[PDB]
């Protein structure tokens, strides 16, 4: 602001219009233009003295596009976070906004006894986003239904600066999961050598028929006839709040440590990236036909509600 020239018999009124950094969006009531009072107040007709806020754009990677392949070369999954237990097991996160990330309740408890309180689990975790950027976590919230929804929320102490590398995915406004839809699953979990992957990778997986999946893992469909038919040692959590994905065209699958990652769909109408699911059952490896994802639609209400406090 160089002072503007004076004009004879006339004076000057000062204003400003606010703009946001790239990757952010102006949030106001409010036209963004603020103007200096005789009271030395910067004011706007709509919002009073209240300034605009800058908010991270979500689900819009700067460069859009696990036992099998697809190395993430371009950094196309900005929302992916890597979480590590005190006892050194890697698992997935997926950043949902500037200070929150979704994850599985199971991932959260990797260190500890299943009755461990969230207060005691949080100091234990290490969380990373983008390149090796660590983020400092404040709090952790398990989902209210222990047995059914495998989900937890991670609140960071403060907002992550958003850039090419780090940026949240979008929560869906609709139900994307119908069979045959191919989502993108990025993950930090174990690979074909049963080693935690050193570089972040992604697979493309089709969503699978829900009845076929339940017949696969359980008897089933009548509850009293259900048996534990899982071809790996352990049983998925399977209900109305979950969906299944098959293997890739190339027979690639998801494995230990991949849970907590998003089943990420790219909406062609929006050109935006939505999290349709969070990987719950990462034990398929190539051994079982189906991974199991908790569907983000089911947890949407709870997410907004929880973030509200």
Partner 1 sequence: VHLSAEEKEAVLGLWGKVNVDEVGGEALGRLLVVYPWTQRFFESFGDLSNADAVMGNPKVKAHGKKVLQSFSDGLKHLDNLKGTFAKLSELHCDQLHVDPENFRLLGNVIVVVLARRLGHDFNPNVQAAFQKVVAGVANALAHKYH
Partner 2 sequence: VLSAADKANVKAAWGKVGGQAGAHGAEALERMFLGFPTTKTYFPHFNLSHGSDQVKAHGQKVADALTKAVGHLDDLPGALSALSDLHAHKLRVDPVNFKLLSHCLLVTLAAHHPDDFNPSVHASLDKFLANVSTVLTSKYR
Ligand X SMILES: *[C@@H]1O[C@H](CO)[C@@H](O)[C@H](O)[C@H]1NC(C)=O
Ligand Y SMILES: *[C@@H]1O[C@H](CO[C@@H]2O[C@@H](C)[C@@H](O)[C@@H](O)[C@@H]2O)[C@@H](O)[C@H](O)[C@H]1NC(C)=O
Ligand Z SMILES: *[C@@H]1O[C@H](CO)[C@@H](O[C@@H]2O[C@H](CO)[C@@H](O)[C@H](O)[C@H]2NC(C)=O)[C@H](O)[C@H]1NC(C)=O
Interacting residue ranges for ligand Y, rule: CB under 6 A: 90, 193, 195-196, 198
Q: Is 42 in the site for its own copies (CB under 8 A)?
A: yes
Q: How far is the CB of 233 from its own copies (least distance, A)?
A: 48
> Are 94 and 261 contacting, i.e. CB atoms less than 8 angstroms apart?
yes
In angstroms, what is the minimal distance from the CB of 289 to partner 2? 6
Q: What letter would DSSP give residue 172?
A: P
Q: How far is CA 305 from the centre of its chain?
A: 16
**CA-based torsion, 63, 66, 71, 73: positive or negative:** positive
Is residue 88 close enough to count as binding ligand Z by CB under 6 A? yes
- Other beta carbons within 10 angstroms of residue 174's beta carbon come to 9
Tell me the closest approach of the beta carbon of residue 109 to ligand Y, in angstroms. 20
Q: Of its own copies, partner 1, partner 2, none, which one sits near residue 232, judging by CB under 5 to 8 A according to partner kind?
A: partner 2
With respect to ligand Y, which residue has the nearer C-beta, 83 or 245?
A: 83
The reply to whether 87 sits near ligand Z by the rule CB under 6 A is yes
Which residue, 48 or 69, is less far from partner 1 as judged by CB? 69
Residues 256 and 190 sit within 8 Å (Cβ to Cβ): yes
CA atoms within 13 A on the CB side of 157: 8
Q: Which does 69 bind (CB under 5 to 8 A by kind): partner 2, its own copies, ligand X, none?
A: none
**Interaction between residue 146 and ligand X (CB under 6 A):** yes
Question: Could you write out the three-class secondary structure of 192-258?
Answer: CCCCECCCCEEEEEEEECHHHHHHHHCCCCCHHHCCCCCCCCCCCCCCCCEEEECCCCCCCCCCCCC
Among 38, 39, 178, 193, binds partner 1 (CB under 8 A): 193
Smaller CB distance to partner 1: residue 218 or 258?
258
Give the Cβ contact number of residue 116 at 10 Å.
Answer: 14
> For the window 94-133, what string marks contact with ligand X as x by the rule CB under 6 A?
--------------------xx------------------
Binding positions for ligand X, rule: CB under 6 A:
114-115, 146
């Amino acid at each position: 602001c160089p002072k503007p020239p004076e004009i004879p018999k006339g004076y000057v009124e000062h204003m400003v219009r606010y703009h946001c950094q790239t990757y952010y969006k102006l949030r106001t009531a409010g036209d963004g233009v603020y103007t200096l009072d005789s009271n030395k107040q910067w004011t706007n007709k709509v919002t009073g003295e209240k300034l605009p806020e800058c908010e991270a754009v979500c689900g819009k990677p700067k460069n859009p596009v696990i036992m099998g392949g697809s190395l993430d070369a371009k950094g196309s999954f900005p929302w992916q976070a890597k979480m590590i237990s005190h006892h050194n097991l890697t698992s997935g996160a997926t950043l949902i906004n500037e200070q929150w990330l979704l994850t599985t309740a199971k991932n959260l408890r990797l260190g500890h006894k299943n009755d461990t309180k969230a207060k005691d689990i949080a100091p234990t975790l290490r969380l990373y986003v983008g390149k090796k950027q660590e983020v400092e976590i404040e709090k952790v919230i398990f989902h209210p239904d222990n047995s059914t929804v495998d989900i937890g929320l991670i609140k960071l102490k403060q907002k992550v600066p958003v850039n090419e590398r780090v940026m949240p995915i979008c929560l869906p406004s609709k139900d994307y999961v119908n069979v045959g839809l191919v989502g993108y699953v990025s993950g930090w979990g174990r690979n074909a050598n049963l080693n935690f992957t050193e570089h972040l990778k992604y697979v493309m997986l089709p969503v699978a028929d829900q009845e076929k999946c339940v017949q696969y893992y359980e008897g089933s469909t009548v509850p009293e006839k259900k048996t534990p038919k899982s071809p790996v040692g352990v049983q998925p959590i399977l209900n109305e709040h979950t969906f299944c994905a098959g293997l890739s065209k190339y027979q690639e699958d998801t494995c230990y440590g991949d849970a907590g990652s998003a089943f990420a769909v790219h909406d062609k109408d929006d050109d935006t990236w939505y999290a349709a699911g969070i990987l719950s059952f990462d034990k398929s490896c190539r051994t079982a036909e189906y991974g199991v994802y908790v569907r983000v639609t089911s947890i949407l209400d709870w997410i907004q509600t929880t973030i509200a406090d």
